[PDB]
């Protein structure tokens, strides 16, 4: 995965904007910004979320989806220094995305660029390298196999 020093930085910066201490509201407002951006990059992928009511991104069903997505991302980050468990965690997340027909690996590349674009606006002294080194490996594990 990624270095122990790198992971440390990622976990620290991430917990700056995400932790058990603040509002689900902030959670989904980051979520909406993240997906809105994924859509503008790959509009073809928006349809994949019609099931969580992507039609209305202010709906409890979609807010809950982004909440879910960020919690997953959080769960992955907090396990960066537990290679064994993380491998198992990503394999699972990987299965939750494969069963979804219409998902191309390229969508996770776009998601990557979105995160690298959104995060710096929320995080103090965001570190693109430490994040790349820790995220990319993740992303490949969650998008390994798909189109």
């Amino acid at each position: 995965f990624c270095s122990e020093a790198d992971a440390t930085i990622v976990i620290k910066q991430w917990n700056q904007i995400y932790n058990a201490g603040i509002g689900a509201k902030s959670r989904w407002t980051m979520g909406n910004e993240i997906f809105s951006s994924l859509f503008k990059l790959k509009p073809e992928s928006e349809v994949l979320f019609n099931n969580v009511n992507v039609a209305n991104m202010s709906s409890g069903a979609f807010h809950a989806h982004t909440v879910r997505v960020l919690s997953g991302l959080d769960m992955g980050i907090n396990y960066l220094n537990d290679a064994g468990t993380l491998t198992s965690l990503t394999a699972h997340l990987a299965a939750q995305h494969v069963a979804r027909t219409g998902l191309k690996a390229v969508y996770f590349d776009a998601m990557g660029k979105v995160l690298m674009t959104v995060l710096p606006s929320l995080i103090d002294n965001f570190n693109p390298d430490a994040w790349r080194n820790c995220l990319l490996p993740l992303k490949n594990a969650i998008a390994k196999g798909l189109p």
Binding site: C2, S3, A5, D6, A130, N133
Partner: peptide, 12 residues
């Protein structure tokens, strides 16, 4: 990774 430039490699 794996051949990435890590925080420790940078310190080094």
């Amino acid at each position: 990774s794996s051949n990435s430039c890590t925080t420790e490699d940078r310190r080094e």
